[PDB]
């Protein structure tokens, strides 16, 4: 599924991401936009052999099992394919674990390079929330 901007904002808000660990909703929408272009089926292979999955490009090295990242962990205790569903519940729950782990949203390279320090509220402007 390819979400609309406000549709995704509303889905993320319902799942408790607005101000989760101090990150306003605009941060999450911005990160999704630049990680996956709002596409739940996005995948990207990294040079170390791991793969990023889903709307928030969650990595198989630590967070999910895809059966082909040897020596990796599965800290969200899910198959990586569950992160490609049109229902974002699994991605959101896993992202909550990630952003709680310590480095906050700096775990998302696209957020750090393209959302951090910008007017992220612009990503939820106009939406009925
Ligand atoms: Cl915001
Ligand atoms: Cl771009
Ligand atoms: Cl594996
Ligand atoms: Cl933080
Ligand atoms: Na893994």
Curated annotation (Swiss-Prot):
It comes from the Eukaryota. PROSITE patterns: GLYCOSYL_HYDROL_F22_1, GLYCOSYL_HYDROL_F22_2. In the egg white and polymorphonuclear leukocytes. GO terms for biological process: cell wall macromolecule catabolic process; defense response to bacterium; defense response to Gram-negative bacterium; defense response to Gram-positive bacterium; killing of cells of another organism. InterPro entries: Glyco_hydro_22, Glyco_hydro_22_CS, Glyco_hydro_22_lys, Lysozyme-like_dom_sf. It is found in: Secreted. Keywords: Allergen, Antimicrobial, Bacteriolytic enzyme, Disulfide bond, Glycosidase, Hydrolase, Secreted, Signal. The keyword Signal applies. Its EC number is 3.2.1.17. It catalyses: Hydrolysis of (1->4)-beta-linkages between N-acetylmuramic acid and N-acetyl-D-glucosamine residues in a peptidoglycan and between N-acetyl-D-glucosamine residues in chitodextrins. Transmembrane segments: none annotated. The active site is at 35, 52. Disulfide bonds join 6-127, 30-115, 64-80, 76-94. Its main location: secreted. Pfam families: Lys. It is an enzyme of class 3 (hydrolase). SUPFAM superfamilies: Lysozyme-like (SSF53955). GO terms for cellular component: cytoplasm; endoplasmic reticulum; extracellular space. Monomer. Belongs to the glycosyl hydrolase 22 family. PANTHER family: LYSOZYME C. This is Lysozyme C. It comes from Gallus gallus (Chicken). The lineage of its organism: Eukaryota, Metazoa, Chordata, Craniata, Vertebrata.
């Amino acid at each position: 599924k390819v979400f609309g901007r406000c549709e995704l904002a509303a889905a993320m808000k319902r799942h408790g991401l607005d101000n989760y660990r101090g990150y306003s909703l605009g941060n999450w929408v911005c990160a999704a936009k630049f990680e996956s272009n709002f596409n739940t089926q996005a995948t990207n292979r990294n040079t170390d052999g791991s793969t990023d999955y889903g709307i928030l490009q969650i990595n198989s090295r630590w967070w999910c099992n895809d059966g082909r990242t040897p020596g990796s962990r599965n800290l969200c205790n899910i198959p990586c394919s569950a992160l490609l569903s049109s229902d974002i519940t699994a991605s959101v729950n896993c992202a909550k674990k990630i952003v709680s782990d310590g480095n906050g949203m700096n775990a998302w390279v696209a957020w750090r390079n393209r959302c951090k320090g910008t007017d992220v509220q612009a990503w939820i402007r106009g939406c009925r929330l």
